[PDB]
Copies of this chain bind each other. A is one copy, B any other.
Amino acid sequence: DFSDFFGSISHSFLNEQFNENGFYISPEEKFIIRSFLRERKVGIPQGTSISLFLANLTCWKLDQDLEREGVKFSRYADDTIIWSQEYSKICNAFNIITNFSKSAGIKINPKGISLLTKKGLPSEITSKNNLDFLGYTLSVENVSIKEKSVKKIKKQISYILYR
């Protein structure tokens, strides 16, 4: 959960990233970024036109480190899922997020670490059969709708009939 990261990230760190990773930011664009940040005081506004760019600009080194490790990841809003085929890789990814939290001055906390396997086969570490990702129950055998989303569908159909 990167919610608190974007709630309070030092704008000085954001500014340090303005000239990294080959980002092409023009002087007027830097003024507009700094103005929208000056309106705020700490953190990036979330759910806005400026959220994606500023989030990518602050987390570019985290993305590079996770890609060097070899783990695959996805950041949706203030949520980040990192998956790998190796336990060591995920542990090293945890270490990367920990280091990035320190370099940013604000911490990132897990929702934490699990193993996804076939339904029949057992597991070593705290494990679940299926992950729940954005309205999907993803399993090794199939992709289905999350039970919450199925409840929502049932609610709408049932209320249509009731009404």
Contacts and interface: CB of A to CB of B under 8 A. Distances in A.
A68 interface: yes
Chain A interface bracket (under 10, 10 to 19, 20 to 34, 35 or more)? 20 to 34
Chain A contact residues, majority secondary structure? loop
Interface string A70-113: 10000000000000011110111001000000000000011011
Interface of A: 67-70, 85-88, 90-92, 95, 109-110, 112-115, 118, 120-126
Copies of this polypeptide in the complex: 4
Contacts of A85: 68, 95
A87 B112 CA distance: 17
A52 B125 CA distance: 35
A88 B87 CA distance: 6
A124 B87 contact: yes
Contacts of A114: 124
Given A86-B88, A92-B86, A126 B122 contact: yes
